[PDB]
Amino acid sequence: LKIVVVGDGAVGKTCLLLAFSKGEIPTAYVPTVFENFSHVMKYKNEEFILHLWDTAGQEEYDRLRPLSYADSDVVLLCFAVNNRTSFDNISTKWEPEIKHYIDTAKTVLVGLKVDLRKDGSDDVTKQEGDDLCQKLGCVAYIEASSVAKIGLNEVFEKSVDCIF
Amino acid sequence: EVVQQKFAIVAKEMKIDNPELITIPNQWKLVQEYEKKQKKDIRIQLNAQKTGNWRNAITDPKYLADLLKTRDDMDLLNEMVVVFRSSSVSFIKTFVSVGGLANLMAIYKKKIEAENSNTAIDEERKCCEVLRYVFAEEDATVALIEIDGGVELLLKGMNSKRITPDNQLDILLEITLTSSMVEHPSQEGLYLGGDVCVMNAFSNLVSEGVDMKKFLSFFSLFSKSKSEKFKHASLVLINNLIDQPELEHRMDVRNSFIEIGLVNELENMKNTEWMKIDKIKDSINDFFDSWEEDKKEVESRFDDL
Numbered sequence A: 001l002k003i004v005v006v007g008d009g010a011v012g013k014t015c016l017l018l019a020f021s022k023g024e025i026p027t028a029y030v031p032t033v034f035e036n037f038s039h040v041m042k043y044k045n046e047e048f049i050l051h052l053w054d055t056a057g058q059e060e061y062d063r064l065r066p067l068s069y070a071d072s073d074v075v076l077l078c079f080a081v082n083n084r085t086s087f088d089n090i091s092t093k094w095e096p097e098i099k100h101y102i103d104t105a106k107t108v109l110v111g112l113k114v115d116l117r118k119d120g121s122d123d124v125t126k127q128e129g130d131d132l133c134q135k136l137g138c139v140a141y142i143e144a145s146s147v148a149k150i151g152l153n154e155v156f157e158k159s160v161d162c163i164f
Numbered sequence B: 001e002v003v004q005q006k007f008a009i010v011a012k013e014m015k016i017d018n019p020e021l022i023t024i025p026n027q028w029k030l031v032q033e034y035e036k037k038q039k040k041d042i043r044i045q046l047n048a049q050k051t052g053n054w055r056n057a058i059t060d061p062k063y064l065a066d067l068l069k070t071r072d073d074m075d076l077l078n079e080m081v082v083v084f085r086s087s088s089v090s091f092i093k094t095f096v097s098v099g100g101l102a103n104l105m106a107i108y109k110k111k112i113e114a115e116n117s118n119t120a121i122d123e124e125r126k127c128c129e130v131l132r133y134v135f136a137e138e139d140a141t142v143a144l145i146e147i148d149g150g151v152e153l154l155l156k157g158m159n160s161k162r163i164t165p166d167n168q169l170d171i172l173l174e175i176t177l178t179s180s181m182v183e184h185p186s187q188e189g190l191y192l193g194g195d196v197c198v199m200n201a202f203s204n205l206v207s208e209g210v211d212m213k214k215f216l217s218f219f220s221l222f223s224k225s226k227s228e229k230f231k232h233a234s235l236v237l238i239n240n241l242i243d244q245p246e247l248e249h250r251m252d253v254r255n256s257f258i259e260i261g262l263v264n265e266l267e268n269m270k271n272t273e274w275m276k277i278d279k280i281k282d283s284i285n286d287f288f289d290s291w292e293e294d295k296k297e298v299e300s301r302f303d304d305l
């Protein structure tokens, strides 16, 4: 099972991956360039092989991110719920990109940093993500926090489900 | 499988200045993927000739170039954004080398002049967005200099009320790059005269009757703009245009700028928070320092007559 993670700079992709499988945070924020490791996950009465491909949110690495897409079964389209701008970029930058390079992949829409969602604020809602999930044809929208340890397993259990 | 220079190819191909940030084991993975994709791209093209998903067929730069002679639509424009933003250096080099830019420029003219509608602003803006990716390649700026009315078209496009402050910046950055490209950047002794190219385009706006005075619309963009990237970039262009080898030609270009309010504009910026930025403080100082040396020189010649 090949899973690739895309989204804007600083929305919490690295943290998402390392919390799911460590499960903690790197303390020091270092912008991703490329990262790739496998990791075994116990789900049902069997173990699974998860090949994780972390990518760069930053524009500087645009001509290189496609090197991560080949043969991807699932792509995680990530934004941060307290960052509408990252949310908008899913449909202008991220989806169009993976649809161009690896249209055979299933997509999971992932709302990151839910722990930080204030109210009265212009943040993204579970409603908006669910709706986008519908327009984009993702398998599911799943909210998560690497900091409060929420949805982590959920996110990666789904990546497996949509493959069985 | 220890070398490991076989990556410096992928590196410059993807525009990566610091590969030292990649763990050796990773840039082997990346090499296998690079090679794998070169093979993948090949298969899709020979295949989409019949499928026929043009979306995959235009991953041939030559094919993309030829298609623009016939297609100018949102779909194609959107796909081109993806392609040019995320492709390899050499994919653009090839596109440009086979026409490509002149073809995209023609479409851009059509878009700039199209009658107003809802789809009009967007169609024009995608164009800017696509051009902004071709121009990240030097060969593209070389190609632009040789297109009749290319720089002029950029100047006109830059004055469109249909585009965004960011669009206007990207075009300016492309004009400025052109203005400084006297010689081919990657060929020893090959004159290109981009400096003269841009100068003429500014003279042509005057003589086609679009600028009431030389430099007016550019200068007026510069004047109200609030980007600070744009103030700086505008200063760089101005100083480049004034930076001429002959005193006669500096005294002349700078006079045109004096004639339209430049001096009073900079002096207002000196009494302003603008000086807090070193890129801009130095450009403004350069202007005055060069204006003063020229006064002394002029005085000095008069003194000998």
Ligand SMILES: Nc1nc2c(ncn2[C@@H]2O[C@H](COP(=O)(O)OP(=O)(O)OP(O)(O)=S)[C@@H](O)[C@H]2O)c(=O)[nH]1
Residues within 6 Å of the ligand: A007, A008, A009, A010, A011, A012, A013, A014, A015, A016, A028, A029, A030, A031, A032, A033, A055, A056, A057, A058, A112, A113, A114, A115, A116, A144, A145, A146, A147, A148
């Ligand atoms: N409050 C909160 N902060 C988070 C969460 N996840 C990541 N962050 C913070 O946001 C910053 C970005 O996290 P990170 O995972 O490294 O972003 P990224 O998506 O990988 O960014 P890039 O590599 O594409 S540039 C980090 O400093 C981290 O502390 C989260 O779930 N909750």
Ligand SMILES: [Mg+2]
Residues within 6 Å of the ligand: A013, A014, A015, A030, A031, A032, A054, A055
């Ligand atoms: Mg990261």
